[PDB]
Write a protein that binds this ligand. Structure first.
Ligand SMILES: *[C@@H]1O[C@H](CO)[C@@H](O[C@@H]2O[C@H](CO)[C@@H](O[C@@H]3O[C@H](CO[C@H]4O[C@H](CO[C@H]5O[C@H](CO)[C@@H](O)[C@H](O)[C@@H]5O)[C@@H](O)[C@H](O[C@H]5O[C@H](CO)[C@@H](O)[C@H](O)[C@@H]5O[C@H]5O[C@H](CO)[C@@H](O)[C@H](O)[C@@H]5O)[C@@H]4O)[C@@H](O)[C@H](O[C@H]4O[C@H](CO)[C@@H](O)[C@H](O)[C@@H]4O)[C@@H]3O)[C@H](O)[C@H]2NC(C)=O)[C@H](O)[C@H]1NC(C)=O
Ligand SMILES: *[C@@H]1O[C@H](CO)[C@@H](O[C@@H]2O[C@H](CO)[C@@H](O[C@@H]3O[C@H](CO[C@H]4O[C@H](CO)[C@@H](O)[C@H](O)[C@@H]4O)[C@@H](O)[C@H](O[C@H]4O[C@H](CO)[C@@H](O)[C@H](O)[C@@H]4O[C@H]4O[C@H](CO)[C@@H](O)[C@H](O)[C@@H]4O[C@H]4O[C@H](CO)[C@@H](O)[C@H](O)[C@@H]4O)[C@@H]3O)[C@H](O)[C@H]2NC(C)=O)[C@H](O)[C@H]1NC(C)=O
Ligand SMILES: *[C@@H]1O[C@H](CO)[C@@H](O[C@@H]2O[C@H](CO)[C@@H](O[C@@H]3O[C@H](CO[C@H]4O[C@H](CO)[C@@H](O)[C@H](O)[C@@H]4O)[C@@H](O)[C@H](O)[C@@H]3O)[C@H](O)[C@H]2NC(C)=O)[C@H](O)[C@H]1NC(C)=O
Ligand SMILES: *[C@@H]1O[C@H](CO)[C@@H](O[C@@H]2O[C@H](CO)[C@@H](O[C@@H]3O[C@H](CO)[C@@H](O)[C@H](O)[C@@H]3O)[C@H](O)[C@H]2NC(C)=O)[C@H](O)[C@H]1NC(C)=O
Ligand SMILES: *[C@@H]1O[C@H](CO[C@@H]2O[C@@H](C)[C@@H](O)[C@@H](O)[C@@H]2O)[C@@H](O[C@@H]2O[C@H](CO)[C@@H](O)[C@H](O)[C@H]2NC(C)=O)[C@H](O)[C@H]1NC(C)=O
Ligand SMILES: *[C@@H]1O[C@H](CO[C@@H]2O[C@@H](C)[C@@H](O)[C@@H](O)[C@@H]2O)[C@@H](O[C@@H]2O[C@H](CO)[C@@H](O)[C@H](O)[C@H]2NC(C)=O)[C@H](O)[C@H]1NC(C)=O
Ligand SMILES: *[C@@H]1O[C@H](CO[C@@H]2O[C@@H](C)[C@@H](O)[C@@H](O)[C@@H]2O)[C@@H](O[C@@H]2O[C@H](CO)[C@@H](O)[C@H](O)[C@H]2NC(C)=O)[C@H](O)[C@H]1NC(C)=O
Ligand SMILES: *[C@@H]1O[C@H](CO)[C@@H](O[C@@H]2O[C@H](CO)[C@@H](O)[C@H](O)[C@H]2NC(C)=O)[C@H](O)[C@H]1NC(C)=O
Ligand SMILES: *[C@@H]1O[C@H](CO)[C@@H](O)[C@H](O)[C@H]1NC(C)=O
Ligand SMILES: *[C@@H]1O[C@H](CO)[C@@H](O)[C@H](O)[C@H]1NC(C)=O
Ligand SMILES: *[C@@H]1O[C@H](CO)[C@@H](O)[C@H](O)[C@H]1NC(C)=O
Ligand SMILES: *[C@@H]1O[C@H](CO)[C@@H](O)[C@H](O)[C@H]1NC(C)=O
Ligand SMILES: *[C@@H]1O[C@H](CO)[C@@H](O)[C@H](O)[C@H]1NC(C)=O
Ligand SMILES: *[C@@H]1O[C@H](CO)[C@@H](O)[C@H](O)[C@H]1NC(C)=O
Ligand SMILES: *[C@@H]1O[C@H](CO)[C@@H](O)[C@H](O)[C@H]1NC(C)=O
Ligand SMILES: *[C@@H]1O[C@H](CO)[C@@H](O)[C@H](O)[C@H]1NC(C)=O
Ligand SMILES: *[C@@H]1O[C@H](CO)[C@@H](O)[C@H](O)[C@H]1NC(C)=O
Ligand SMILES: *[C@@H]1O[C@H](CO)[C@@H](O)[C@H](O)[C@H]1NC(C)=O
Ligand SMILES: *[C@@H]1O[C@H](CO)[C@@H](O)[C@H](O)[C@H]1NC(C)=O
Ligand SMILES: *[C@@H]1O[C@H](CO)[C@@H](O)[C@H](O)[C@H]1NC(C)=O
Ligand SMILES: *[C@@H]1O[C@H](CO)[C@@H](O)[C@H](O)[C@H]1NC(C)=O
Ligand SMILES: *[C@@H]1O[C@H](CO)[C@@H](O)[C@H](O)[C@H]1NC(C)=O
Ligand SMILES: *[C@@H]1O[C@H](CO)[C@@H](O)[C@H](O)[C@H]1NC(C)=O
Ligand SMILES: *[C@@H]1O[C@H](CO)[C@@H](O)[C@H](O)[C@H]1NC(C)=O
Lengths: 142, 493, 142, 142, 52
């Protein structure tokens, strides 16, 4: 992709600039170019496809891109908010001592100040999604 | 009314047959290359479930056996082949005749001696007979000095070398040598090619644990009644990784086991009478092996450019030998009692009618005990030991076997047929200096075989692989399949 | 890891805490440990990464971790559940002779009594979705 | 081997299918058969698993199929129609000169007539999603 | 139909004992040999494999 996603960096957290489409287009551009090379290599070298170091390396970089995509989509589905921007989860923020300055701090600066909250939050967000869905089951039965 | 509905996150599983990850702490060679680091998590939780466990028909034990074997093979694979050494060597005749590799009828020996000569000899740490390697009954090692012509990388030049072989490693041509310099070849060269185990294999301990991949879990029996085969195990413990395993391969007795407990357990194969008897650690049973003498090691570069480690000893050292300490007499009494009370046993309840015994035949892989002492294999004849621990009335075992001792004579063999079901021959490089090993004894490998209510024969076995079923065995691998179906009234919208 | 799937085992069919999100997190754990080890091996061995049996066993478990994740998401999609806590269906249960005791039997016991139906049910659930897609298509034309 | 898509290929654009679940079924059949063989190969041959070229060809084939599956899902997520049939985007059709005959042309015939529009359309659809996304961000913030 | 055309050749080959060797009886199909030509007025012609 063009990596235009990070172009806004330095703009401050509240300066909009968030997007849900940037990773799909980066991955899609990647897949087309990588598949073309997988099919291009055999025009000169058909035996040594992963029998060499470069073969193994190309495997590793194609797989890494896929694993990364799945890690993020899987986590969002766990929280349920795959297409919801802000997502609106019901888990309260841990404490008042860690509040962002939306018109001063950037997302890079902010995220590095809350790395230890993500460790407790991920689990809370997942449970909130489970509780909401089991309540819907009871409502459908009623 | 009732629709199938599908529930996700369901706490249910089925039998898995997949590869496990190895994880270790020793990352000097094979660990960094093949294994995950040991996560260090040894915790477990219990479930209120009943599950069926079987040590022999297990995937966990099956992988332990096969993986230890393969990490051995991938270590020796790139080492120097010794086919360039399968040439006639010129060996000292006195030595090849003296230790039986060649024949002579000119020795015309005649011996008259007392037959009422059996002795009892005990040794312990506080004794000069150990420090000096001279206990009653210990003879010389039987090393044979041979010369041979070998070529290095210069090709058009060659040198003569001094190699001292153990007698167990040579064949030696027989008949009409009326002079000196007998003609010898390596014991297992001609039907095959011997490869050197050059990458320090067996020079240190190999310990690792197995971890289930995501979506899989290990279940374990946490009973005291687990006897290898248990249709309904009521105490089932859940974990992601196994206990740490010691991948040690010795016959008759297992050493350095992780399942060291203040209890005697006997696993019986459910369909057979082959068993693994753990020993009660209470008695601090230990084996101390010594290989006397200061060895010199001389690297030789041969043709391909790879190096072979020769043994130009030029000496006559005492035999390697092993000393047994700890309360052996009492540990054995418990084994016999444990067998008597065991649920699969319907033999004699008289402990004086239950005996340990060697397997018969002339086959050294079952009649001896093979201990890997830091890289050198040490086969040990154990009649003195068995006579002692049993307090056996020897009487008619022939004069050198009638003794009761807590130590046994042993010999070093460098060309070792491997333990797995391959038949492959490898060469074990010598260790420089002397060798001493102090190991714990944790298990006995034996069959229990009785046909009546008198004479039960705990027959020592050489199937080294059985030991892995004591190290693990109580583990089962399962797949988590968290999709369930169940009728309910809640039809979509 | 966590094994919340086993932690609730034995609680009966009228189960609490069906930790749906557990599959997403078990995938993440898999990726992280294997990726770290693959990055570690080249420190000493750069060539024989897949070319020695240890690396064929480790590649197989990496590719499989991706495939197992996808089999479950794909089956769930095949049955109409983008997210499945219970995701109710239109397919009736095969017969009244096989009804769980919600307050006595466990999921382990229950599932092992209906493996027979799972094979026939999987197909029925997929067929129901096919007809639902056809119905949506007719509505799109209208 | 469901062949659900090809089955309606000879009809008309304004006539049939628009099936989503068939891709999941195809992937599931593929993964299961590959897994059964991968479990089977070690029963006789453990050493030559990726070492020789046949195993690299099977690996590239599997990786390409996984990337393809995810490629379509990623494109749909960008457009939002992960599960929306017709999606309903707001980007105008490039010109009135190129119009389908819903009752005479098939989708195969049609798609081959718009290959030179897709190059511009994919980008335009993504740009439209981006502006809509920005508008939704501000509305959610308010 | 005629005879197959097989040629009986002897040679000295060494196995794993290296300093010991044996002579072997190998019968080749005629198309598998090259054979050196000129002034053999006795027996034992000198041949090599066709593609070595
Ligand atoms: C997950 O993993 C676990 C752990 O591995 C799995 O658990 C194991 O699953 C196995 C497969 O089902 C079980 O083995 C099978 O047991 C059957 C039943 O065996 C008993 O009955 C036999 C005959 O009795 C009949 O009549 C009675 C009337 O009351 C009926 O109730 C019976 O059902 C029968 O119809 C009897 O002969 C057996 O005794 C012999 O075997 C047991 C084995 O434990 C020994 O302990 C005994 O000493 C005895 O052994 C002698 O005889 C056998 C030959 O039979 C020799 O091989 C021995 O050396 C010795 O001389 C039991 O009392 C068996 O019928 C069944 O055999 C049939 O099927 C196999 C193919 O699978 C054929 O090869 C056979 O020839 C035969 O047709 C088999 O042995 C394990 O017991 C069970 N393990 C545990 C700990 O529970 C679990 O299933 C896995 N789950 C999944 C989903 O994969
Ligand atoms: C059952 O279990 C018991 C344990 O309960 C086992 O017994 C123990 O086994 C240990 C592993 O073999 C052994 O440890 C070795 O002892 C050697 C002797 O060292 C002595 O002094 C040191 C202090 O300096 C003490 O710590 C030690 O306990 C002894 O008293 C050491 O030499 C070994 O150290 C080596 O490995 C480390 C690894 O990090 C190296 O840093 C170090 O330099 C040594 O390296 C040599 O060996 C390695 C093997 O990996 C080679 O790769 C390396 O190149 C070196 O080898 C060369 O040097 C030697 C001469 O030194 C030469 O012969 C060779 O040809 C090479 O040139 C290590 O510390 C325990 O001592 C031992 N304990 C007891 C009480 O017995 C028992 O084996 C198990 N039994 C069974 C049945 O398997
Ligand atoms: C770790 O394992 C040890 C064994 O290896 C355990 O030690 C054993 O503990 C039991 C239970 O207390 C003792 O059993 C008692 O022994 C006395 C003494 O009887 C003696 O004389 C009779 C003949 O009259 C003879 O048959 C016996 O063998 C003894 O020689 C009895 O009076 C009691 O009724 C009972 O049987 C064992 O004797 C003792 N063994 C040893 C070697 O000391 C130890 O308890 C275990 N540790 C833990 C923490 O569980
Ligand atoms: C381990 O060895 C013991 C001792 O040989 C085996 O015990 C034997 O068990 C078999 C049955 O598995 C007995 O055969 C049956 O005996 C009954 C009662 O006489 C008879 O009615 C049957 O027709 C049949 O002959 C056998 O007698 C018994 N032998 C003794 C001395 O107890 C044991 O089974 C062996 N374990 C395995 C799995 O091989
Ligand atoms: C590999 O060598 C063994 C032994 O070598 C021969 O016998 C020794 C006693 C000695 O005289 C050496 O110089 C000889 O070369 C061969 O095994 C012998 O085979 C014969 C014939 O079957 C049998 O009578 C002997 O008892 C066997 N001796 C032993 C010790 O096993 C073996 O056949 C050779 N293998 C190959 C492929 O050549
Ligand atoms: C061992 O058990 C016997 C009883 O069982 C007999 O011997 C077994 C080995 C087996 O062959 C069975 O089938 C036999 O039936 C005990 O013998 C009894 O001992 C008491 C005294 O304590 C005596 O009054 C009884 O009459 C004896 N019974 C018989 C049938 O003789 C024997 O004492 C037990 N020995 C040990 C060490 O436990
Ligand atoms: C491999 O050998 C062939 C043939 O061997 C030579 O010619 C035979 C008739 C016989 O006399 C053998 O002992 C000889 O060694 C070589 O082919 C010949 O090449 C020359 C030169 O180009 C040509 O004039 C001949 O006609 C060829 N003869 C045949 C039968 O093809 C060939 O060149 C050798 N290859 C190499 C690399 O040495
Ligand atoms: C194994 O145990 C023996 C004792 O049986 C140890 O040998 C002693 O080592 C000390 C320290 O170097 C010496 O002072 C003693 O003289 C040695 N005893 C004898 C009989 O020689 C030995 O060091 C222990 N382990 C290893 C690996 O060698
Ligand atoms: C970065 O600096 C340039 C001036 O060089 C300015 O125009 C631009 O808006 C700045 N970007 C951000 C995110 O503040
Ligand atoms: C409370 O705020 C402090 C501010 O630095 C932070 O370190 C701490 O972890 C917070 N407590 C939580 C999340 O419970
Ligand atoms: C296993 O058994 C021991 C007693 O022998 C007990 O202390 C331990 O807690 C048990 N483990 C589990 C997970 O229940
Ligand atoms: C061995 O090599 C030496 C030279 O290093 C040479 O003098 C001697 O004759 C050789 N012996 C044999 C049997 O080839
Ligand atoms: C030794 O010599 C005798 C003749 O004296 C002969 O019969 C015998 O076969 C010879 N043995 C060997 C091994 O050469
Ligand atoms: C022993 O070897 C020497 C050569 O080193 C030789 O001269 C002598 O004759 C040999 N001994 C016998 C009995 O042949
Ligand atoms: C498991 O057993 C314990 C007692 O050891 C009991 O308190 C607990 O409720 C039981 N749980 C289940 C699910 O049966
Ligand atoms: C009907 O119930 C019986 C149990 O009585 C079960 O074996 C059978 O598979 C069931 N059939 C269907 C279609 O569910
Ligand atoms: C569970 O078993 C009890 C008898 O112990 C019975 O009264 C109850 O109705 C059963 N529950 C269900 C859901 O069938
Ligand atoms: C599945 O359907 C087939 C008919 O296609 C029937 O014979 C079989 O019994 C059914 N299985 C179950 C569990 O009802
Ligand atoms: C395809 O041809 C068959 C006759 O072989 C006919 O029955 C069917 O209606 C045709 N389908 C279409 C879409 O034209
Ligand atoms: C206009 O229509 C022609 C004819 O179908 C086509 O080739 C051209 O690409 C179209 N232009 C645009 C902007 O879509
Ligand atoms: C299909 O072709 C017929 C002429 O055969 C024409 O009348 C009809 O309008 C066309 N359908 C469409 C959708 O253009
Ligand atoms: C070849 O066979 C003949 C018999 O036709 C035999 O006399 C001769 O010794 C054999 N030669 C070899 C090298 O085996
Ligand atoms: C054969 O002998 C003649 C002399 O009579 C000589 O000129 C010719 O080169 C020889 N040919 C071969 C192949 O030796
Ligand atoms: C055939 O070979 C023998 C040697 O085995 C030799 O004596 C004889 O002279 C040869 N024949 C001819 C025609 O030269």
């Amino acid at each position: 992709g063009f990596l235009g996603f990070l172009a806004t960096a330095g703009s401050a957290m509240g300066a909009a600039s968030l997007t849900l489409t940037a990773q799909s287009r980066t991955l899609l551009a990647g897949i087309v170019q990588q598949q073309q090379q997988l099919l291009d290599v055999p025009k000169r070298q058909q035996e040594l496809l992963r029998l060499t170091v470069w073969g193994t390396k190309n495997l590793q970089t194609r797989v890494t891109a896929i694993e990364k995509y799945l890690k993020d989509q899987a986590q969002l589905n766990a929280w349920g908010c795959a297409f919801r921007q802000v997502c609106c989860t019901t888990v309260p923020w841990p404490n008042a001592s860690l509040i962002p300055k939306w018109n001063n701090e950037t997302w890079q600066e902010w995220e590095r100040k809350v790395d230890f909250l993500e460790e407790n939050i991920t689990a809370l967000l997942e449970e909130a999604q489970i509780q909401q869905e089991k309540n819907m089951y009871e409502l459908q039965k009623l | 009314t009732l629709y199938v509905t599908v529930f996700y996150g369901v706490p249910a599983w089925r039998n898995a047959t997949i590869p496990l990850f190895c994880a270790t702490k020793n990352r000097d060679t094979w660990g960094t290359t093949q294994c995950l680091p040991d996560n260090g998590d040894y915790s477990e939780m219990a479930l209120n479930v009943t599950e069926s466990f079987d040590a022999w028909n297990n995937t966990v034990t099956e992988q332990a056996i096969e993986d230890v074997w393969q990490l051995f093979e991938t270590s020796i694979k790139p080492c120097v082949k010794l086919s360039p050494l399968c040439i006639t060597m010129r060996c000292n005749k006195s030595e090849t005749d003296r230790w039986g590799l060649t024949k002579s009828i000119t020795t015309t020996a005649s011996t008259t001696s007392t037959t009422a000569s059996a002795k009892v000899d005990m040794v312990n740490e506080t004794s000069s007979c150990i420090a000096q390697d001279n206990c009653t009954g210990l003879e010389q090692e039987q090393m044979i000095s041979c010369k041979f012509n070998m070529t290095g990388l210069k090709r058009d030049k060659s040198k003569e070398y001094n190699e001292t072989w153990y007698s167990a490693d040579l064949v030696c041509e027989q008949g009409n040598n009326t002079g000196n310099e007998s003609r010898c070849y390596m014991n297992h060269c001609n039907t095959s090619v011997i490869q050197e185990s050059c990458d320090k294999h067996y020079w240190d301990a190999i310990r690792f644990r197995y971890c289930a991949p995501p979506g899989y879990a290990l279940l374990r029996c946490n009973d005291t009644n687990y006897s290898g085969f248990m249709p309904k195990c009521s105490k089932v413990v859940v974990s992601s990784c196994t206990r740490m395993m010691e991948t040690q391969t010795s016959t008759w007795f297992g050493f350095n086991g992780t399942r060291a407990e203040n209890r005697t357990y006997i696993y019986w194969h459910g369909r057979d009478n082959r068993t693994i008897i753990s020993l009660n650690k209470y008695y601090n049973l230990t084996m101390k092996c010594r290989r006397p003498g200061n060895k010199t090691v001389l690297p030789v570069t041969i043709m391909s450019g790879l190096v072979f480690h020769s043994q130009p000893i030029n000496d006559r050292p005492k035999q390697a030998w092993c000393w047994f300490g700890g309360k052996w007499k009492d540990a054995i009494k418990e084994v016999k009692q444990t067998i008597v009370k065991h649920p699969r046993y319907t033999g004699t309840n008289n402990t004086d009618k239950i005996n340990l015994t060697a397997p018969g035949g002339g086959d050294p892989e079952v009649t001896f005990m093979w201990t890997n002492c830091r890289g050198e294999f040490l086969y040990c004849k154990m009649n003195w030991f068995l006579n002692w621990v049993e307090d056996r009335n020897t009487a008619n075992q022939k004069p050198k076997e009638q003794h009761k001792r807590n130590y046994v004579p042993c010999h070093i063999r460098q060309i070792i047929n491997t333990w797995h079901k391959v038949g492959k021959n490898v060469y074990l490089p010598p260790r420089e200096g002397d060798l001493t090993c102090n190991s714990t004894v944790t298990s006995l490998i034996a069959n229990i075989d009785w046909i009546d209510g008198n004479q039960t024969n705990i027959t020592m076995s050489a199937e080294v692989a059985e030991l892995y079923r004591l190290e693990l065995g109580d583990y089962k691998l399962v797949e988590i399949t968290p999709i369930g179906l169940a009728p309910t009234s809640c039809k979509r919208y």
